[PDB]
C-alpha cells in the first residue's frame, strides 16, 4: 500500500524544484520535510506519495461546523495516511490525531524590520504605534487566544479587534508586510521560520527577544493508526544519529545569504 | 488505587526539604518534579506516593542479562506505575516503556572550571591534558558510545579506555571532580543540570559552548499502560498554560546564588 503523505508548500520545508514542470511525482519537490519524508519511509520500509494539502492550511477547527480543515482534516477524514510538515504538536490536535515525538524544537518569536524599536513582547503590548499580528488558522493565533498570561492576553485583546486585520493568510504575506511597513508592523511567528527568513536577502528582518513559548513539530498520523509506532521510533533514531541536525544545517544555514 | 511514582534525588528536580525529618510522605520532598507530579495528579485526578528508586539509577540494560535497572526497570518489571524525573527520552527506552511528549528540552553540554581553556567538544577531542567524562548508566554515555560523528566517536575511544576512570556515578560526583581538578577535568552532562549548577555557590563553574545534541525529558509509564494517555494530554496542557515555564523559573533562576 502506497502511503499517502499530506504536506504543504512552506520554505524551506517543502518547495517546488526549479524545473518541477519537467519532473514527476515525488521528484517535483525539495526541502527539509521532503528529505525527512524519504528517510522516514526508508527506515519504516514503505513507499509513499507526497501530495500538497488542497486548501493550503495546517488545520484549525471551524467553531460553527466543528469540521477540521487543512492537513489535520485530511488525517481526521481519511484522505491521508500521514502528514510530514512543520505541524505544531498542540493539545487540541493531539485529541483528534496522533503525533510522533518532535523532530524539531521551536517557539513563537517576534520578527521586526531591522531598526524597529522593540525588544520584547512586553514592549509590543505597552504601545500602539507599531501594529502586530499572526498567521490565521495556526497554533500561534490559538496560543494568544487561549493564554491567561497578562502580557499575551493583552496582546490578544489588541489583535482580535485591530482594524484593518493584523492577521495574515501565509508566512510570505506576513514577511512582506514587515518589509513593506517601514517598521510599523511586527510579525509573530515560529522561531524556525523567523531564523530562516533572517538568513535570506534582502537581509532586512531580524528575530528579537527570547521565544514566547517552547514546543515542537511532530509527524502526524490518524488516531490509532498502526504507522504511528514505527514512525515515532524512526524519528528518535534519526535524531540520535544526528540526521535532524544535519538537515537543519543544510536547509537553513549552509546557504544563508546574509 | 494510589499511583506509585518512582523518582530519583537530583537537584533541583527532587530534593529533601530542609526540615524533612519533621515531615512525612510526599511532604518530605520539594522541587520541579515534585511540583510537576502534583499538577499531573490533579489534572488526571489521582492520588500518588512518591518513592525514591532503590538503586539510585535512571535506567540502562545490562549487556549480559538484558535486565533493566533504575527507574526504567521499576516500570518494566511492574514495581511502579509512573516515573516523574529528568528521564531522557531515547530510542532504546521507548522500545520498552512509554513516554509523554517532553516537558523540558535539553542537550548534552560541557561543564568546566572557570578559567579552563576549552571552548567546544572539538577542543576536548584534540587534546589530552584536560581529562573529561560522563555519568554511568545514562543517555549521555550511550550517546557517545553510539555516535557515528567523527568528533563524538573520537572522544568515546578516549573515554572508554582512560585510566583512572573518567566516569562518575552521580551528577554531584562529576561536579565535585570538576571543582577539585584545578581545571584538568571537564564534565559532560545535560544542559539543564549545567545551567542550574552555574547559578550556585561557590560559582566556580560554567557551561561552555553550545549543546552537542537536542533532546527531551518525558514522563514514563509501563508499555501500554492506561495512565499514558491522560498524562500525555496533561503535559501538553501544562506546557500550554505556561506552568512548565513558571516551574523552571521557580527552580533554576528565581533563587540563583551567582
Ligand atoms: C506556517 C503555518 C501557518 C503553521 C506552521 N506551524 C503552525 C501550525 O502547525 O499551526 C503554523 C505557524 C503559525 O501558527 O505561527
Ligand atoms: C543524571 C542522570 C544520570 C540522567 C538524567 N538524564 C539522563 C538519563 O535520563 O539517562 C542522565 C544524565 C546524562 O546521562 O548525563
Ligand atoms: Zn513553479
Ligand atoms: Zn538512513
Ligand atoms: Zn534526615
Ligand atoms: Zn494546573
Task: For residue A154, report the phi and psi dihedrals to the nearest 5 degrees.
Answer: -55, -45
Q: Which of B139, B238, B246, B117 is nearest to B193 (CA)?
A: B139
Q: CB atoms < 10 A from the CB of B107, how many?
A: 16
Class for the domain spanning A1-106+216-255 = alpha beta
Element (H, E) at A45: none
Torsion angle of C-alpha atoms B224, B229, B230, B231, degrees rounded to 10: 80
Domains B1-106+216-255 and B107-215 belong to one CATH topology: yes
How many whole angstroms separate alpha carbon A142 and alpha carbon A131? 19
Which residues of B are annotated as part of the binding site for L-glutamate?
86, 88, 93, 139-140, 190
Domain A107-215 in CATH 3.40.190.10: yes
Question: Best mutation site among B94, B95, B99, B100 for testing chain A: the one with the most A CBs within 10 Å?
Answer: B94
How many whole angstroms separate alpha carbon A52 and alpha carbon A38? 16
How many whole angstroms separate alpha carbon B130 and alpha carbon B124? 7
Element (H, E) at A49: strand A48-52
Positive or negative CA dihedral for B115, B116, B122, B126?
A: positive
Domain ranges of chain B: 1-106+216-255, 107-215
How many whole angstroms separate alpha carbon A199 and alpha carbon A196? 5
Strand partners, A88: A217
Residue A221 per-residue DSSP state: E
A192 CB under 6 A from ligand 1?
A: no
A54 CB contacts (<8 Å, ≥6 apart)?
A: A74
Q: What is the 3-state secondary structure (H, E, C) of A85-97?
A: CCCECCHHHHCCE
**How far is the first Cα of chain B from the last one, in angstroms, to the nearest whole number?**
44
How many whole angstroms separate alpha carbon A98 and alpha carbon A188? 26
Task: For residue B109, report the phi and psi dihedrals to the nearest 5 degrees.
Answer: -140, 170
3-class DSSP assignment, residue A130: coil
How many whole angstroms separate alpha carbon A37 and alpha carbon A121? 35
Give the distance from CA B14 to its chain's centroid. 11
How many whole angstroms separate alpha carbon B256 and alpha carbon B258? 6
- Nearest 5°: the CA angle A99, A102, A106 is 125
**Contact present, A88 and A215 (Cβ < 8 Å):** yes
**Contact present, A189 and A171 (Cβ < 8 Å):** yes
B175 CB contacts (<8 Å, ≥6 apart)?
A: B111, B187, B197, B205
Q: Please report the beta strands in B120-225, taking only residues with DSSP state E, as ranges in sequence order.
A: 131-133, 185-190, 205-208, 215-217, 220-222
For the purposes of burial, counting CB atoms within 10 Å of the CB of B229, is it exposed (0-12), middle (13-18) or buried (19 or more)?
Answer: middle
How many whole angstroms separate alpha carbon A57 and alpha carbon A80? 14
Resolution (A): 2.0
Question: Which chain B residues have a beta carbon less than 8 Å from that of A107?
Answer: none
Strand partners, B185: B131
Closest in A148, A215, A237 to B239, CB measured: A215
Pairing between β-strand B108-113 and β-strand B185-190 as defined by DSSP bridges: antiparallel
Element (H, E) at A79: none
Supply B212's cell numbers.
Answer: 552537542
Closest in B94, B146, B233 to A236, CB measured: B94
Radius of gyration of chain A (CA): 18
**Contact present, A100 and A218 (Cβ < 8 Å):** yes
How many whole angstroms separate alpha carbon A69 and alpha carbon A60? 6
How many whole angstroms separate alpha carbon B253 and alpha carbon B258? 10
| Nearest-CA distance A18 → chain B (Å) | 33
Q: What is the 3-state secondary structure (H, E, C) of A159-188?
A: HHHCCCCCCECCHHHHHHHHHHCCCCEEEE
Counting runs of H as helices and runs of E as strands, what totals does chain B give? 10, 13
Q: Which of A247, A219, A245 is nearest to A233 (CA)?
A: A219
How many whole angstroms separate alpha carbon A104 and alpha carbon A98? 16
**How far is the first Cα of chain A from the last one, in angstroms, to the nearest whole number?**
44
How many whole angstroms separate alpha carbon B48 and alpha carbon B41? 7
Question: Best mutation site among A105, A236, A241 for testing chain B: the one with the most B CBs within 10 Å?
Answer: A236
Supply B180's cell numbers.
Answer: 577539585
How many whole angstroms separate alpha carbon B89 and alpha carbon B93? 7
How many whole angstroms separate alpha carbon B224 and alpha carbon B227? 9
Radius of gyration of chain B (CA): 18
Q: For A203, left (φ over 0), alpha (ψ -120 to 50), or beta? A: left
A137 CB contacts (<8 Å, ≥6 apart)?
A: A57, A58, A59, A60, A69, A70
Q: Which of B215, B216, B250 is nearest to B232 (CA)?
A: B216
The experimental method behind these coordinates is: X-ray
By alpha-carbon position, which residue is closest to atom 11 of ligand 1?
Answer: A138
Amino acid at each position: 500500500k502506497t502511503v499517502v503523505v499530506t504536506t504543504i508548500l512552506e520554505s524551506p520545508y517543502v518547495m517546488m524544484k526549479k524545473n518541477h514542470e519537467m519532473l514527476e511525482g515525488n521528484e517535483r519537490y525539495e526541502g527539509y520535510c521532503v528529505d525527512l519524508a524519504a528517510e522516514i519511509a526508508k527506515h519504516c520500509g514503505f513507499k509513499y506519495k507526497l501530495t500538497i494539502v488542497g486548501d493550503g492550511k495546517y488545520g484549525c477547527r471551524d467553531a460553527d461546523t466543528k469540521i477540521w480543515n487543512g492537513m489535520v482534516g485530511e488525517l481526521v477524514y481519511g484522505k491521508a495516511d500521514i502528514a510530514i510538515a512543520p505541524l505544531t504538536i498542540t493539545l487540541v490536535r493531539e485529541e483528534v490525531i496522533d503525533f510522533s515525538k518532535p523532530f524539531m524544537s521551536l517557539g513563537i518569536s517576534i520578527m521586526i524590520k531591522k531598526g524597529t524599536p522593540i525588544e520584547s513582547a512586553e514592549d509590543l503590548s505597552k504601545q500602539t504605534e507599531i501594529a502586530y499580528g499572526t498567521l490565521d488558522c495556526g497554533s500561534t493565533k490559538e496560543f494568544f487566544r487561549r493564554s491567561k498570561i497578562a502580557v499575551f492576553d493583552k496582546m490578544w485583546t489588541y489583535m482580535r479587534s485591530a482594524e484593518p486585520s493584523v492577521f495574515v493568510r501565509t508566512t510570505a504575506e506576513g514577511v512582506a508586510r514587515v518589509r513593506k511597513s517601514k517598521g510599523k508592523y511586527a510579525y509573530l511567528l515560529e522561531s524556525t521560520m523567523n531564523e530562516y527568513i533572517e538568513q535570506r536577502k534582502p537581509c532586512d528582518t531580524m528575530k528579537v527577544g527570547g521565544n514566547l513559548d517552547s514546543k515542537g513539530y511532530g509527524i502526524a498520523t490518524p488516531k490509532g493508526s498502526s504507522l504511528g509506532n514505527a514512525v515515532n521510533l524512526a524519528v528518535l533514531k534519526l535524531n540520535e544519529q544526528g540526521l535532524l541536525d544535519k538537515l537543519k544545517n543544510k536547509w537553513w544555514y549552509d546557504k544563508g545569504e546574509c
